[PDB]
Amino acid sequence: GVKNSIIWFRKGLRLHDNPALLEACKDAKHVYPVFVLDPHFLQQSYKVSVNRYNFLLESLEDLQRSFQARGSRLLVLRGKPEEVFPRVFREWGVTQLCFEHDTEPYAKVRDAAVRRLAAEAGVEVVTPISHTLYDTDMLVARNGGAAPLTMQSFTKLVDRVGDPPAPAPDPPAAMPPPAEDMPSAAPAATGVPTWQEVGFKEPPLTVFKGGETEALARLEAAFQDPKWVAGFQKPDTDPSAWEKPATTVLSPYLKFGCLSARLFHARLLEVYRRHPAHSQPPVSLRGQLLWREFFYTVGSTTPNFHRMAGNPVCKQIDWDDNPEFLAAWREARTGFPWIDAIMTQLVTWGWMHHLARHSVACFLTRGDLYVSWERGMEVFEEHLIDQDHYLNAANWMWLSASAFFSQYFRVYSPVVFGKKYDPEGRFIRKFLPVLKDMPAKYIYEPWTAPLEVQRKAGCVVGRDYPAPIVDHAVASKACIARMAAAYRRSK
Ligand SMILES: Cc1cc2nc3c(=O)[nH]c(=O)nc-3n(C[C@H](O)[C@H](O)[C@H](O)COP(=O)(O)OP(=O)(O)OC[C@H]3O[C@@H](n4cnc5c(N)ncnc54)[C@H](O)[C@@H]3O)c2cc1C
Ligand SMILES: [Cl-]
């Protein structure tokens, strides 16, 4: 004989568009849905926010409910894959192990080791591509052996290849369950823990709930107005909108695979066929999935892509070791309310609009503080619920003019940028309530408010809210000079 399979979740935390799951179930007597949880992961070198970890746990709870509805259940195995799988292969009489391919660096090492162990145990391994739109190694190959290095050339490449594969069918309404009385499948050892049980001491504050069920609901909400979908232009959306965010907020769901990228793409093409004036890449909503695909393709084929040194696409720049500036930025006490409000949204929600990320990343790196993008990436990695190895690295290199982007004379203003969208400061007042009573005329520049106004607002600069840590005009002039010199050194 009979077929006993494992469907191993890592990303791809969904039942829809899951070719790995469909193969695991095919002709199977027993199917073991597995997630491998690392019970000491939170005891490391890298801190992880409860927001992101709890989003994962909610996503696993949703998978558990989906499998239970179909006569099965999710097995959250504790330990390391290379240690756990050899034992459960033999315990469960496994003949096939299926999982979605993952092109991240650690994934490649882990998966090579598991493939070796599967072969020793006589286990067939099936690893379909479905986290990305395309087989990104196929894209590189069709491009002549190297990844495109511009978004425009990347878009031309995928258009020559054609449409991404359609999303796979839904799985059957009933699934083969684990076998009975298998000790490694004992319910008490294989349940989804809570954030308290994994060791977090403060509760999650984010407003976006994990899981495939929420992902599909938010997909449908995005598609309730096909004219908005068709006309979407990313650079024209409003980073100060928080009650109704100006973009889809599907990124955490795409990061964890709660939402299929191929489903999203197929739904876009359906709308586009009915709206021939729809927006085109890069600014379109399909363009956004292509930004993701572009950075996955370059990132996966570039050594040390998430670092500066040893990264062949990355400019070597003489960033300052300035821990005081990094700390003020990380801790949302720069004294620029637009910046501090965005950094507070980072820690509270784990998600900000793309141009809000632009504002704070420019400020930290080539715009004002001249701190390395690697340090900014680490702070984002701790807190983002959509934290994505390749996307975070690529966008930090873009924003610091280290790769892909080189126009270091374009510097966002930490005062003016948000005011053009939100002159009343509704976003600032939401995330920085200490400023909730500051007249709009001063809310982006509270240090300019008369002391009488600061006192009446209950927000005295230097006491209740810090003074700005730099003069933007002075800081940006200095950073631009350093960037120019760094570019000349790389000649
Ligand atoms: C400094 C910095 C760090 C970032 N770190 C991350 C990260 O860790 N994870 C992440 O998913 N995105 C990251 N982004 C990209 C982008 O800001 C987010 O993808 C976007 O804000 C997610 O919101 P949304 O789902 O509403 O996007 P939409 O505009 O609705 O786009 C739909 C989907 O397309 C993808 N996408 C959109 N914009 C980009 C982009 N610029 N690059 C790559 N893919 C994109 C995402 O999967 C997103 O969910 C970063 C950007 C910057 C400037
Ligand atoms: Cl764009």
Ligand SMILES: [Cl-]
């Ligand atoms: Cl600006």
